[PDB]
Design an enzyme around this catalytic site. Structure first.
Site, mmCIF file in Angstrom:
data_model
loop_
_atom_site.group_PDB
_atom_site.id
_atom_site.type_symbol
_atom_site.label_atom_id
_atom_site.label_comp_id
_atom_site.label_asym_id
_atom_site.label_seq_id
_atom_site.Cartn_x
_atom_site.Cartn_y
_atom_site.Cartn_z
ATOM 1 N N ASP A 134 63.841 -3.804 -103.660
ATOM 2 C CA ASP A 134 62.959 -5.121 -103.446
ATOM 3 C C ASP A 134 61.751 -4.660 -102.554
ATOM 4 O O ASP A 134 61.495 -5.459 -101.555
ATOM 5 C CB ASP A 134 63.840 -5.707 -102.510
ATOM 6 C CG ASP A 134 63.625 -7.296 -102.146
ATOM 7 O OD1 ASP A 134 62.879 -7.671 -103.258
ATOM 8 O OD2 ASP A 134 63.978 -7.969 -101.368
ATOM 9 N N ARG A 138 56.665 -8.889 -98.287
ATOM 10 C CA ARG A 138 57.354 -9.531 -97.410
ATOM 11 C C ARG A 138 58.338 -8.654 -96.755
ATOM 12 O O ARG A 138 59.110 -8.868 -95.910
ATOM 13 C CB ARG A 138 58.065 -10.630 -98.305
ATOM 14 C CG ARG A 138 59.150 -10.246 -99.411
ATOM 15 C CD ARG A 138 59.521 -11.573 -99.881
ATOM 16 N NE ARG A 138 60.330 -10.866 -101.119
ATOM 17 C CZ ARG A 138 59.724 -10.497 -102.352
ATOM 18 N NH1 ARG A 138 58.525 -10.763 -102.627
ATOM 19 N NH2 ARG A 138 60.509 -10.081 -103.349
ATOM 20 N N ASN A 139 58.524 -7.535 -97.272
ATOM 21 C CA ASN A 139 59.597 -6.426 -96.762
ATOM 22 C C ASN A 139 58.954 -5.177 -96.223
ATOM 23 O O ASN A 139 59.642 -4.431 -95.762
ATOM 24 C CB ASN A 139 60.459 -6.007 -97.787
ATOM 25 C CG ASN A 139 61.486 -6.962 -98.359
ATOM 26 O OD1 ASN A 139 61.938 -7.863 -97.514
ATOM 27 N ND2 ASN A 139 61.731 -7.194 -99.450
ATOM 28 N N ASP A 152 64.094 -3.658 -94.934
ATOM 29 C CA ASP A 152 65.015 -4.356 -95.581
ATOM 30 C C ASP A 152 65.893 -3.546 -96.418
ATOM 31 O O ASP A 152 65.636 -3.040 -97.637
ATOM 32 C CB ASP A 152 64.197 -5.322 -96.384
ATOM 33 C CG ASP A 152 65.314 -6.350 -97.635
ATOM 34 O OD1 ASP A 152 66.516 -6.471 -97.026
ATOM 35 O OD2 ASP A 152 64.826 -6.746 -98.275
#
Ligand SMILES: Cc1cccc(Cl)c1NC(=O)c1cnc(Nc2cccc(C(=O)N3CC[C@H](C(=O)O)C3)c2)s1
Length: 286
Positions: A134, A138-139, A152
């Site tokens: 992922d 955003r992570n 994450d």
């Protein structure tokens, strides 16, 4: 894995502000007992066995790592409820929101430095036999030295918890083989890293704009790729393009990515040569 973790007493932990939240807990900014700021993620009473395994599993995984570009675990509260994971506090938050709030405020060299840090963390994870699945801006978290750190972690919780993952994966960050046949490897993380390069250089533009997930998949399969960002060094656009090779074996490894980015940073005039930007608009004046 939890034998590697420090058990912290609750009286050492003050939660001060909510900075993230979900249905089964929140993330806080807080202080930890010489007091230091920390982030604190909670798990509320009533959690299931699977939630406990996923939650403490994230801390278990993070406790196996020691790298400048990977979020550092300080410890856990597991003997008292609510349970907590305590990490270093990244003062500037998530990279995607950070860039969108700071549009145009950094030099090209600063942006490439951020990418080098992300790539170094990812090379470490890959060599430690950890596939992220992922990777996206955003992570990534950003601190007050502009250091970007990968975050994450976990097993099933990673794609389950992410709203960008649809019935379940975040399609427009994911390599073709991971979508088509569930093959997640460090080389699919390299594809994702190419997307993160494009997110950084565009100050957080959403990959593929308003194309639907199906339209993104069809475009990639037809050979289309994201166009160059504005003001992007040619070497950086060439690098992100090679991360998006359909054939997994043609993609650079993170070792190659870190090497190239480090050479560009150490001869920064190499970054002054820009890839041509295809304007989507025509302004002409007499
Ligand atoms: C990565 C991780 C995994 C498991 C458990 C935990 Cl506790 C963590 N650590 C984290 O989630 C975080 C570490 N640092 C974080 N920093 C962060 C996140 C989101 C926003 C902000 C931020 O910039 N803020 C500015 C306004 C407000 C503030 O000043 O605190 C929040 C900072 S989150």
């Amino acid at each position: 894995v939890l034998k590697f973790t420090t058990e912290i007493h609750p009286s050492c932990v003050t939660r001060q502000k909510v900075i993230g939240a979900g249905e089964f807990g929140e993330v806080y900014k807080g202080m930890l007992k010489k007091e230091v700021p920390v982030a604190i993620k909670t798990l509320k009473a009533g959690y299931t066995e699977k939630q406990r395994v996923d939650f403490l599993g994230e801390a278990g995984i993070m406790g196996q790592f020691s790298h400048h570009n990977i979020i550092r675990l300080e410890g856990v509260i597991s003997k008292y409820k609510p349970m907590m994971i305590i990490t270093e506090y990244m003062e500037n938050g998530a990279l995607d929101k950070f860039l969108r709030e700071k549009d145009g405020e950094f030099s090209v060299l600063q942006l490439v430095g951020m990418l080098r840090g992300i790539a170094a963390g990812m090379k470490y994870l890959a060599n430690m036999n950890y596939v992220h699945r992922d990777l996206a801006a955003r992570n990534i978290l950003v601190n007050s030295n502009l250091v970007c750190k990968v975050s994450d972690f976990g097993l099933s919780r990673v794609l389950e918890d992410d709203p960008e993952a649809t019935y379940k994966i975040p399609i427009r960050w994911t390599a073709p083989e991971a979508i088509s046949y569930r093959k997640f490897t460090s080389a699919s993380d390299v594809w994702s890293f190419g997307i993160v390069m494009w997110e950084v250089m565009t100050y957080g533009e959403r990959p593929y704009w308003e194309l639907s997930n199906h339209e993104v998949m069809k475009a990639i399969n037809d050979g289309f790729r994201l166009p160059t960002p504005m003001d992007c060094p040619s070497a950086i656009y060439q690098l992100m393009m090679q991360c998006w090779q359909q054939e997994r074996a043609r993609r650079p490894k993170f070792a190659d990515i870190v090497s190239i980015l480090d050479k560009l940073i150490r001869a920064p005039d190499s970054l002054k040569t820009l890839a041509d930007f295809d304007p989507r608009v025509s302004i002409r004046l007499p």
